[PDB]
């Protein structure tokens, strides 16, 4: 599997000040790199995709660069909504991994949170007001506190095709239900280390950049 690490992962910085994040990969990534801004109630939206482009919205004063192994993700004026922790992710082998993180500081429905006993299992949900559910991938993004997401898997609403993150195979299963525009995602047998927040994103046009998010949904073991 393919790694990626930001080297920083943590920077304070001032209001227009210039801040460029790193992001290297263990091996070619043939420019098929995200970055992902994650606010700190949470929300996360795709902001650059395959390397350089900005997603509609974005304002100029982001860009990004990169080739082969190494990338970078720069604000040229840092303003205060630029608050939040920034994640790079690679699109060039599955299963889609992502970068530890850089938190910047100033010097989809889914269901509700739940509290499980170890051992139990939980199916959340994510419903899609989206009319291109059951044409699109709705992906699943594991956040544990401070570390790398990591991505689940992934199913096709249109005829139930999945792919896994093999290390997930064994503790997750996703299904979705055209009628009701709703996937879900079943997770076995709790440990401590399963408590996290789980994330359903969407993908379509770019299989491997997640354009649309839902809000997470807060998983916790007793």
């Keep these: 599997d393919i790694v990626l690490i930001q080297s920083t992962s943590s920077l304070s910085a001032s209001l227009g000040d210039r801040v460029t994040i790193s992001c290297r990969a263990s091996q070619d990534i043939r420019n098929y ?6 606010k700190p109630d949470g929300t996360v939206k795709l902001l650059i995709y395959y390397t350089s482009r900005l997603q509609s919205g974005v304002p100029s004063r982001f860009s990004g660069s990169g080739s082969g192994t190494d990338y970078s993700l720069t604000i040229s004026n840092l ?5 939040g922790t920034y994640f790079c992710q ?9 970068g530890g993180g850089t938190k910047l500081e100033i010097r989809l429905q889914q269901s509700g949170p739940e509290l499980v006993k ?21 992906n699943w993004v594991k956040q544990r506190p401070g570390q790398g997401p990591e ?8 005829d139930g095709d999945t792919n896994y993150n093999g290390k ?15 996937a879900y995602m079943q997770l076995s047998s709790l440990t401590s280390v399963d408590s ?3 994330f359903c994103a969407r993908s379509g046009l770019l299989r491997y950049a997640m354009d649309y998010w839902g809000q997470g949904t807060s998983v916790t073991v007793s």
Excluded: H
């Design 33 to 38: 790199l995200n970055w992902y801004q994650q």
């Design 79 to 83: 303003e205060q909504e630029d608050i």
């Design 90 to 98: 690679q699109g060039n082998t599955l299963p889609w991994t992502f």
């Design 118 to 138: 170890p051992g139990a299992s939980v199916k959340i949900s994510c419903k899609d007001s989206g009319y291109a559910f059951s044409s699109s991938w709705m």
């Design 151 to 158: 991505w689940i898997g992934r199913i096709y609403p249109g």
């Design 168 to 182: 997930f195979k064994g503790k997750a299963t996703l299904t979705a239900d055209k009628s009701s525009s709703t």
């Design 196 to 198: 996290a927040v789980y």
